[PDB]
């Protein structure tokens, strides 16, 4: 099984609590709550910008990987590569996108 990708996300079903979609405010923040509801619309495949390679030449080290997804980003001023920056170069086939979809409830 190690030949395939890892990071298996476990699941959990049958929760003893169900809350409607009107009684949730700031008291249920960051709480795993089981909330149902009808789906209005869905979105297909969206090429989310999650990692873009940039060719650099200063210490024989290519810049990356970066973080540009909607979950978390890296603001300029504190680079993860020990706070380093150099020349950039736009590519055409070194961009690996991540799946991302939004659902209306």
């Amino acid at each position: 099984y190690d030949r395939i990708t890892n990071h298996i996300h476990v699941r959990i079903s049958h929760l003893p609590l169900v809350e409607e979609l009107r009684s949730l405010r700031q008291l249920h923040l960051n709480q795993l709550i089981r909330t149902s509801g009808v789906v209005t619309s869905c979105t297909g495949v969206l090429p989310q910008l999650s990692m873009v390679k940039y060719n650099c030449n200063k210490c024989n080290f290519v810049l990356g990987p970066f973080c540009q997804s909607q979950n978390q980003e890296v603001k300029p001023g504190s680079c993860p590569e020990c706070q380093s920056a150099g020349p950039f170069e736009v590519n055409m086939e070194e961009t690996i996108y991540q799946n991302y979809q939004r659902i209306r409830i």
Partner: protein, 171 residues
């Protein structure tokens, strides 16, 4: 770029050798553009720089200057030879000075140009930003300035056709 001329622009005096005059040190400056668009040029920029050999302000004196009649025309080839996967092109053609009112729409020509590019200062490293331009060295006219000249066939054969005729030459 061969084909049929479609659109034609106006005639504007293009500045070539501007008489740079300075109301101070009284010095002459011979500055040439550098953008692969005029005659002698180099890949640089043409956004009216402020550089000078003596760092003096220069103004264009139109007393003894040299102009150039600039007129850009478009040439589109006929779509009668277009297969099923190719699209015609349209590149502008720069006219000359001694060819005023010699490129009217609805007439075929025969121009000889040189395809070049314009450098851009957008960003640090210049990528694949290269626009289309054509510097025509000579514009030739086939159906306007040129015409089928006569010879020894349009002098004798025309007179003999009206003499030894049959009834009337109108029929």
């Amino acid at each position: 770029v061969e084909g049929i001329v479609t659109k034609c622009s106006l005639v504007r005096p293009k500045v070539v050798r501007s008489v740079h005059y300075c109301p101070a040190t009284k010095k002459t400056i011979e500055r040439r553009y550098s953008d692969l668009t005029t005659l002698v040029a180099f890949p640089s920029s043409s956004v009216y720089p402020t550089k000078d050999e003596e760092n003096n302000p220069l103004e264009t004196e139109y007393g003894l200057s040299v102009y150039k009649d600039h007129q850009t025309i478009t040439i589109q080839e006929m779509p009668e030879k277009a297969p099923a996967g190719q699209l015609p092109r349209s590149v502008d053609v720069i006219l000359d000075d001694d060819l005023v009112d010699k490129a009217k729409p609805g007439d075929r020509v025969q121009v000889v140009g040189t395809y070049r590019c314009l450098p851009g200062k957008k960003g640090g490293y210049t990528s694949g930003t290269f626009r289309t331009v054509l510097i025509a060295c000579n514009v030739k006219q086939m159906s306007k300035d040129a015409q089928p000249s006569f010879s020894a066939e349009d002098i004798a054969k025309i007179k003999k056709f009206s003499k030894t005729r049959s009834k009337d030459i109108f029929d």
